[PDB]
Amino acid sequence: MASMKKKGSVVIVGRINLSGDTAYAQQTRGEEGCQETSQTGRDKNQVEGEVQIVSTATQTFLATSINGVLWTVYHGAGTRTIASPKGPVTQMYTNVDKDLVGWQAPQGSRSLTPCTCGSSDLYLVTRHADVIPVRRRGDSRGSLLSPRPISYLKGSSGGPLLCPAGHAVGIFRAAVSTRGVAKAVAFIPVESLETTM
Numbered sequence: 446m447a448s449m450k451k452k453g454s455v456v457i458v459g460r461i462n463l464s465g466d467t468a469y470a471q472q473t474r475g476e477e478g479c480q481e482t483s484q485t486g487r488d489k490n491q492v493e494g495e496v497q498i499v500s501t502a503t504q505t506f507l508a509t510s511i512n513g514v515l516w517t518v519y520h521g522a523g524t525r526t527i528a529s530p531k532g533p534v535t536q537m538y539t540n541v542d543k544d545l546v547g548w549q550a551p552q553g554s555r556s557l558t559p560c561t562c563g564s565s566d567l568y569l570v571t572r573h574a575d576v577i578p579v580r581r582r583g584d585s586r587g588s589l590l591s592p593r594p595i596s597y598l599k600g601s602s603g604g605p606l607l608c609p610a611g612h613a614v615g616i617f618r619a620a621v622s623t624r625g626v627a628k629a630v631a632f633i634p635v636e637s638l639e640t641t642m
């Protein structure tokens with residue numbers, strides 16, 4: 446029992462800047478600081494924007510603020526806490542059946558508005574700041590207009606699918622691939638988030 450160690454916290458290591466006319470990734474913490482912060486759970490870095498890049502000791506992915514909740518995927522964050530200025534913050538939502546988890550949105554972040562447009566012309570934001578057009582094909586599926594290797598989507602779970610007006614339509618969860626080529630994406634619809642809330 447004295448042998449038992451504790452898993453670290455999820456740590457914000459950067460963000461996807463969507464403020465200006467060009468989307469681009471920004472890193473705010475290096476790996477050494479990330480490991481330190483994951484162990485203590487104390488993150489004093491200023492947080493900005495809607496789409497955060499987050500990391501565990503072993504994985505990196507995305508987290509998206511919608512309606513005051515920072516959402517990400519269970520297969521990335523598990524039940525882990527998230528680092529914050531005051532220490533680790535326990536998850537506010539956990540749903541393994543939806544592959545979804547959520548924490549209170551960090552101070553200084555900006556939240557996306559849940560989409561009510563009903564549009565099927567979507568846009569997926571990746572960890573490399575690519576804005577990929579996606580046609581909605583179902584409640585939780587969308588097809589890439591320009592397919593590409595799954596390598597380009599790896600690490601983007603937790604990122605947003607946006608409507609033409611910039612509302613949040615869903616959280617990126619999985620890729621549908623054929624011969625390593627991503628043709629479609631599975632995602633957590635914002636309505637499912639609003640229900641969980």
Ligand SMILES: CCC1(OC(=O)N[C@H]2CCCCC/C=C\[C@@H]3C[C@@]3(C(=O)NS(=O)(=O)C3(C)CC3)NC(=O)[C@@H]3C[C@@H](Oc4nc5cc(OC)ccc5nc4C)CN3C2=O)CCCC1
Nearest residue numbers: 504505506520521544595598599600601602618619620631
């Ligand atoms: C055939 C089943 C189908 O498709 C697929 O499963 N395809 C695969 C192709 C993988 C090849 C690479 C995929 C590329 C990008 C993918 C966007 C990202 C991503 O980027 N992750 S990541 O950031 O790199 C990472 C790992 C966090 C750090 N998601 C993934 O990799 C995702 C992880 C896992 O699926 C799930 N695991 C769980 C696990 C839970 O408890 C443990 C609970 C619920 C849960 N729910 C899931 C749907 C496999 N995953 C796929 O995407 C499911 C829905 C449509 C059909």
Ligand SMILES: [Zn+2]
Nearest residue numbers: 560562608612
């Ligand atoms: Zn909308």
